[PDB]
Amino acid sequence: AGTGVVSVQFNNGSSPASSNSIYARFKVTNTSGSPINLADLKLRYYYTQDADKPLTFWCDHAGYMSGSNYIDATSKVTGSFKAVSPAVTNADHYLEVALNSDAGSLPAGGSIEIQTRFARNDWSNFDQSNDWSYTAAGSYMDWQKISAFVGGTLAYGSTP
Ligand SMILES: [Ca+2]
Ligand SMILES: [Zn+2]
Ligand SMILES: [Zn+2]
């Protein structure tokens, strides 16, 4: 039921099922026929918490081409962790990646790369094997288990 305003690829550097870091990297492509305000772009990654501990979010790198100038939006990305009510199998929470009001505009046919990760404050191990959006992907690939919303409506992927 995705609008196809954007296409999205994913990879997590093929992280181990048991890991103290969850990686989530997206290559988002504007396939609608007009600029898109990065402010309107949300990305979601569904998982099972396994333990209720404080998490820390990191955006390692984010950037895109605007005309012929390369724009580094790394510092403009934010991450949020919210519950999935009601909880479904392999999904009781989800990471929501967003960008600040002035991130910029993604030009028609343009691409933005967003590399993120998160971990518990105590670095204990997660069990990614019971995470809905999890799959060991070492290179970008079309993975339909993550979602992208534009302006509040699903544009790519699915939700549990
Ligand atoms: Ca889990
Ligand atoms: Zn919480
Ligand atoms: Zn919670």
Q: What is the rounded distance between the termini?
A: 13 Å
Bound ligand species: calcium ion, zinc ion
SS content category: mainly beta
Q: Kindly report the CATH topology.
A: Immunoglobulin-like
Largest sheet: 5 strands, antiparallel
Give the CATH level 1 class: Mainly Beta
Our count of helices gives: 0
Question: What is the share of helical residues?
Answer: under 10%
How does the overall form come out from the CA principal axes?
Answer: globular
Q: Tell me the β content.
A: over 45%
Query: How many domains is the backbone divided into?
Result: 1
Element order, helices and strands?
A: EEEEEEEEEEEEEE
For the largest sheet, list the strands in their spatial order.
1-3-11-6-7
> Quick one: how many beta strands?
14
CATH architecture assignment: Sandwich
Oligomer: monomer
Rg from alpha-carbon coordinates: 15 Å
By CATH, the superfamily comes out as: Endoglucanase-like
Protein name: Scaffolding protein
Domain CBM3: 2-160
Organism: Ruminiclostridium cellulolyticum
Binding site for Zn(2+): 93
